A paper describes a structure:
EccC, the motor subunit of T7SS, is essential to assemble a stable membrane complex for the secretion process. It contains a two-pass transmembrane domain, an unknown function domain (DUF), and three Fts-SpoIIIE-like [name] domains (ATPase1, ATPase2, and ATPase3). In this study, we have provided high-resolution crystal structures of ATPase3 domains of EccC proteins from Mtb, all in complex with ATP. In our structures, ATP and a magnesium ion bind to the nucleotide-binding site in a similar manner.
To determine how MtEsxB is recognized by MtEccCb1-ATPase3, a structure of the complex was determined at 1.98 Å resolution. Only the C-terminal 14 residues of MtEsxB was stable through strongly binding to MtEccCb1-ATPase3 according to the high-resolution density. The first 11 residues form an α-helix while the last three residues form a short loop. Most importantly, it is the side chains of Met98 and Phe100 in MtEsxB that insert into the recognition pocket of ATPase3, which is located in the gap between ɑ2 and β4. The phenyl ring of Phe100 is sandwiched by Asn445 and Phe469, with Leu442, Leu446, Arg449 and Val471 all located within van der Waals distance. Met98 is surrounded by Leu423, Ala425 and Leu442. Additionally, Leu94 is close to ɑ2 and interacts with Glu437 and Ala441. Superposition of the MtEsxB bound and free MtEccCb1-ATPase3 structures showed that the bulge loop moves by ~3.5 Å to allow Gly424 and Ala425 to form interactions with MtEsxB. Thus, the shift of bulge loop could further strengthen substrate binding. A previous report showed that Asp87 in the conserved Yxxx[D/E] motif of MtEsxB is required for secretion, however this residue makes no interactions with MtEccCb1-ATPase3 in our structure.
Numbering used by the authors:
A (entry chain A): 320 to 580
B (entry chain B): 87 to 100
């Protein structure tokens, strides 16, 4: 029981020299999300290939702060012509997470069911036009040459609350048909959820679509019965400490901290 | 109310 991870590592210490918008697409979407316990190196989301990130945690385990930090890491690497953000943030805890330059030109800040439903519907209209022509080869698919512009990051905090306040259409329904092609259309969802509701979320048509197709999942503090798993290690942890699960492996990390606005 | 339905999606900068 020697303690290898810091209790707090600032984003700037985790990511002191981020590459900038002049780098290629793959470099710009290798996003650091925490410090590895095994060798004290940064763990990365490979978002040029695996587009999403899921963040599950008990109350005050760091969900919103970590979402804020990872958003800033993405903006350090990408110009407004390379990424735009749409926020679902009913508690308004992420309003300054993204510089204004990097917000989507309209529908960017959604703090209730009515606004989010309108914004997501409009986003789906635009993203649907990026679906690839059926005859594209794998090489053409990977080149993403048939559309041009920014990737979109759909930054979603407190998904359990969004689902809980959902009046009418289940939230994100216009995007559900587009999720299988998310990598091809430049869509990234980064979603936090309270752990007491994350297990059921992994079966739904938004968080559960991403989870079921192998999105990296960060398990912050939680109780064992909230996410039954013999493979994952869900237990109480200090804020920011997480069991990260991805198709590449399973490992304990310390997720980046950033000061609140 | 045709221009109206696309008044949001047409202004997102795509
Ligand atoms: N990456 C981190 N590393 C260490 N400590 C952190 C980290 N992120 C947050 N904290 C600490 O945890 C506290 C709560 O963090 P935060 O509000 O982001 O968690 P939360 O899970 O979003 O809380 P809530 O349950 O209110 O939504 C912060 O005041 C901060 O001190
Ligand atoms: Mg929070």
């Amino acid at each position: 029981p020697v303690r290898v991870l810091p209790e707090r590592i600032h984003l700037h210490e985790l990511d002191p020299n981020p590459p900038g918008p002049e780098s290629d697409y793959r470099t710009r979407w290798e996003i650091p999300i925490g410090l590895r316990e095994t060798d004290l190196t940064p763990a990365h989301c490979h978002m040029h290939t695996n587009p999403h990130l899921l963040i599950f945690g008990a109350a005050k385990s760091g969900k919103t702060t970590i979402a804020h930090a990872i958003a800033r890491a993405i903006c350090a690497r990408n110009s407004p012509q390379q990424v735009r953000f749409m926020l679902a943030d009913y508690r308004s805890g992420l309003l300054d997470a993204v510089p204004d330059t990097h917000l989507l030109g309209a529908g960017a800040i959604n703090r209730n069911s009515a606004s989010l439903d309108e914004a997501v519907q409009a986003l789906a209209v635009n993203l649907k036009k990026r679906l690839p022509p059926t005859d594209l080869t794998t090489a053409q698919l990977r080149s993403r040459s048939w559309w041009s512009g920014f990737d979109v990051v759909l930054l979603v905090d407190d998904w359990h609350m969004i689902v809980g306040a959902a009046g009418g259409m289940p939230p994100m329904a216009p995007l559900a048909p587009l999720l299988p092609a998310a990598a091809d259309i430049g869509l990234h969802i980064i979603v936090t959820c309270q752990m007491s509701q994350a297990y059921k979320a992994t079966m739904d048509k938004f968080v559960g679509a991403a989870f079921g197709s192998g999105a990296p999942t960060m398990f912050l503090s939680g109780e064992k019965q909230e996410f039954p798993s013999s493979e994952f290690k869900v237990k109480r942890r200090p804020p920011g400490q997480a069991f990260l699960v991805s198709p590449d492996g399973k490992e304990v990390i310390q997720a980046p901290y950033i000061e609140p606005p | 109310d045709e221009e109206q339905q696309q008044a949001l999606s047409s202004q997102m900068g795509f």
